[model samples]
Target: GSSGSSGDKPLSNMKILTLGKLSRNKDEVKAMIEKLGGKLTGTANKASLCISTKKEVEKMNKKMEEVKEANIRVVSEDFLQDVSASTKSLQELFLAHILSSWGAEVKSGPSSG
Candidate 1:
C-alpha cells in the first residue's frame, strides 16, 4: 500500500472544479478525470482542486477569496493535460508542488541560505 506502482491512485476521489474557458476539450478532460478516479465537479465549495489560469483568477476578484477560504488547491490547465496524457501517478509528476516550491525559492532567492 505504501509503494505499489500497480495501484497508483493519487487523484482518487478528488473533486475538481474547472473555472474559465479551457483551450482543451472539456469532454476529454472529464473522461480523463474519471479514468484517474477523480470527479469533475461544478461547485467550488465541494471541490478539493481548482483548474484555472492566472488571467481568469485575476478577473475573479472576490470569488478568489472564496476559493482561498475553502482551501482548494488551484492548478493550471496544463496540469490536467499532463496528468491525463501520462500513465504515471500524480505523485510522480508533483506538478503543483514543484512549481510552487520553485516559485517560492525564486521569490526569496538563495541569499537567505
Candidate 2:
C-alpha cells in the first residue's frame, strides 16, 4: 500500500467492512483498507462495501441472508485482493471486480474503463 497523507487514500469516504476472512494477512489487509482511506467497521449493516469470504460449513447462513437483504455488495476475499492490487480508481476497480466475480471478464476495446 502507498504511504502518504490523506490525499493519497484511494478508498476515502467508502465504508469498507470485512467478514469471514479478509486476507491471509489480516494486519496488512486492515492497513491497506486504511491506506486506501476506507473506514473499517465490524457492523455489516453500516458498510457500503463488504469485503467478505465464504467458509465451508460455518453455519452462518442466516447472518449471510440478512446481509444480503441489506442490499450492500457482499464481495469475496478474492474480489478484495483484486481491488487492492489494481491501480485503477475505486469505481473502475469495483466494476472490474464485479465483472470478474461472476466468471466473466471486461472485454475492453482500445480503451478500458
Candidate 3:
C-alpha cells in the first residue's frame, strides 16, 4: 500500500469516495478496505463498490495478488470500413462492492466524486 510514511507529513483526513464497477467478491473487497484503513460502503452483482479513501484505491491497484482481472471486460472494438475504434471497460470492481454494500443505487455513466 506504499505505506513507507510521508516522513512526518500530516495525512489528509478528507476521504475520496469513488464509485466504479468491481469484479470481485464482497469478502475480498471488505478485506482490502480494512487492510487499507478504510471501510466498505456497498456492493452489487453488477460488480460495484464504494471505497473510503484514495489510499485504498492505490493500495488495491498496487497489490497484484488481490487485484485480479476477474474476466471483467475493459474494452471493445467496433468493426468499421478501413477504420476501427475501441471502447474501454471499467475495471474498478472494488467501487461496485462498496456501493452494493452501502445499498446505494448505481447510476449509468463515468465515475464521479
Candidate 4:
C-alpha cells in the first residue's frame, strides 16, 4: 500500500482589495467579501477588505449562494470614477456594517496608500 501522507503545501498570502469602483450599497460588497473569506481592515472611510488567500475569492466567484444573492451592482476596477476623492467614512461605514454582522474582524487605523 502507498503512504497516505502528503508533504506540506505553501500557505497563501492575503489578497488586498484597493476598492476602486464600489456600489453605493455596502451590503453588496459585504456579502461579496464575506463569501471570499476576507475581513475588513481599518476604520470608517479609509478602510479595505482583505482575504487570506486568492483561492477564497476564486471559490466565492463560483458559489452561486454568495454571488447570486448580492443586490449591488458589480463594477470593474476600470470603471470611470474618482475613487481617490471619495470619503473614507462612507466606505468604512459600509465595511463595518458587513464585518460586524458577519463576524469578521475589523483592523483599526487607516489603510495605506
Whose lDDT is greatest here? Answer: 1
Candidate 3 deviation (Cα RMSD): 15.7
Question: Could you give candidate 2's per-residue lDDT for residues 17-108 as a string of tens digits?
Answer: 66665555666666667767776766655656656664511334655543454544555555556665666765566555542132123221
Model 3 is weakest, by summed lDDT over 10 consecutive residues, at: 75-84
Per-residue error for 17 in candidate 3, Å, reads 7.3
Ranking by lDDT: 1, 2, 4, 3
Worst 10 residues of 4 by lDDT: 7-16
Candidate lDDT values, in order: 0.58, 0.54, 0.28, 0.29
- Alpha-carbon error at 104 in model 3, in Å? 18
Q: Show where candidate 1 strays beyond 4 Å.
A: 1-8, 61-65, 85-113
Native-referenced Cα lDDT, model 1 = 0.58
lDDT of 3 by residue, 1-113 (tens): 66664331110121112333344444564444443333444222222223333344334453211222221111111111001121221233323222222223334334333
The TM-score, computed over Cα atoms with residue i paired to residue i, of candidate 4 is 0.22
State the displacement of the C-alpha of residue 33, model 1, in Å, after optimal TM-score superposition: 1.6
What candidate 4 gets wrong by more than 4 Å, as runs, is 1-21, 41-113
How far out, in Å, is residue 3 in model 4? 27
Q: What is the lDDT of residue 69 in candidate 3?
A: 26
Best by TM-score: 1
